[PDB]
Amino acid sequence: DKTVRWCAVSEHEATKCQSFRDHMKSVIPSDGPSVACVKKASYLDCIRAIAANEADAVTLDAGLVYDAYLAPNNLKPVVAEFYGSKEDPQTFYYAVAVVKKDSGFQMNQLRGKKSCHTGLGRSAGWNIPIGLLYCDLPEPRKPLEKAVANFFSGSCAPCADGTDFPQLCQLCPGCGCSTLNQYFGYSGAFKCLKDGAGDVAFVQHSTIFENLANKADRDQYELLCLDNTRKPVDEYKDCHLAQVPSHTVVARSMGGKEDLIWELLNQAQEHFGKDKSKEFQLFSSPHGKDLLFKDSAHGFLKVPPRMDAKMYLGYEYVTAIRNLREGTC
Numbered sequence: 145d146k147t148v149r150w151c152a153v154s155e156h157e158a159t160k161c162q163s164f165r166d167h168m169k170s171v172i173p174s175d176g177p178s179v180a181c182v183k184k185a186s187y188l189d190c191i192r193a194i195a196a197n198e199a200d201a202v203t204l205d206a207g208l209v210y211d212a213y214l215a216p217n218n219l220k221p222v223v224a225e226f227y228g229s230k231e232d233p234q235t236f237y238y239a240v241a242v243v244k245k246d247s248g249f250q251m252n253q254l255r256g257k258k259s260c261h262t263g264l265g266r267s268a269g270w271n272i273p274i275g276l277l278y279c280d281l282p283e284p285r286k287p288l289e290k291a292v293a294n295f296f297s298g299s300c301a302p303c304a305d306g307t308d309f310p311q312l313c314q315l316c317p318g319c320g321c322s323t324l325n326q327y328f329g330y331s332g333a334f335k336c337l338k339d340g341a342g343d344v345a346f347v348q349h350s351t352i353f354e355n356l357a358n359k360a361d362r363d364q365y366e367l368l369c370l371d372n373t374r375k376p377v378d379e380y381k382d383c384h385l386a387q388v389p390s391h392t393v394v395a396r397s398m399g400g401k402e403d404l405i406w407e408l409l410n411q412a413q414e415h416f417g418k419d420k421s422k423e424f425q426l427f428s429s430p431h432g433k434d435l436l437f438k439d440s441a442h443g444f445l446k447v448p449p450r451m452d453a454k455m456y457l458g459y460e461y462v463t464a465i466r467n468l469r470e471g472t473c
């Protein structure tokens with residue numbers, strides 16, 4: 145029982161959140177957990193708000209789960225999204241690089257091309273691809289933003305500082321950090337490629353399938369494999385850049401309401417999970433893609449007792465992030 149203040153990032157998420165609240169109100173008893181919606185402009189404002197007791201929960205891509213864990217925020221992962229299916233839940237997804245058919249370049253010929261990223265610091269859209277190209281970048285590789293801006297001939301890196309690194313917002317002026325920026329996120333990064341602004345989009349394996357319904361339209365795209373070859377989009381399992389951890393809901397380490405967060409999400413998935421309700425869907429929305437939770441998620445899994453971000457993420461992934469911040473070739 146009682147309220148969970150969910151942090152919505154911008155307008156579209158705020159709208160889905162209010163629908164969430166209302167529908168949960170009609171199915172959950174008076175003694176059940178309720179939702180309240182707190183709208184912020186960016187995920188970073190959501191992280192600050194939770195730490196300052198202005199909100200209670202927000203779902204974050206795993207690369208951002210690390211930042212949320214750092215002081216003075218010290219948030220912890222409490223609920224994880226899972227993909228694939230209820231039968232065989234997967235707590236990871238594949239980072240891939242999508243390109244247009246016959247564009248004529250491999251992974252080792254990315255210098256000078258234009259890039260579309262889901263957002264600064266995110267797993268598939270930034271951490272994995274930039275981590276793999278780190279040494280191909282020109283010195284000085286610090287700050288990272290500068291070297292990336294000089295490697296590509298223009299990008300859209302949402303949440304980056306367009307004032308200090310204008311090239312990173314060339315494809316999306318402002319580098320807006322929310323769905324108000326049409327090239328934000330997985331589907332936004334794909335749109336950036338589809339529209340012709342960029343040459344490559346760093347997204348997840350399911351992104352193209354969530355955006356292109358005809359095999360004929362998808363046959364116009366390919367994936368860049370690490371062996372400097374290209375494969376069709378259905379072959380991501382044999383052509384991906386890395387496997388990364390699921391997006392996860394984070395909460396305060398003190399007075400965090402993790403029990404209510406789990407109670408709310410568990411009930412929510414039972415009533416409004418995949419193919420559960422015709423009235424409301426937790427994992428899709430007429431208002432946008434990946435609002436509050438990823439459209440590709442099938443449900444939630446509780447994170448084990450008192451697990452910190454580092455253990456949750458794993459040594460390899462946390463290493464990759466570290467080596468990206470300081471890193472020596």
Ligand SMILES: [Fe+3]
Nearest residue numbers: 205206267268
């Ligand atoms: Fe992600």
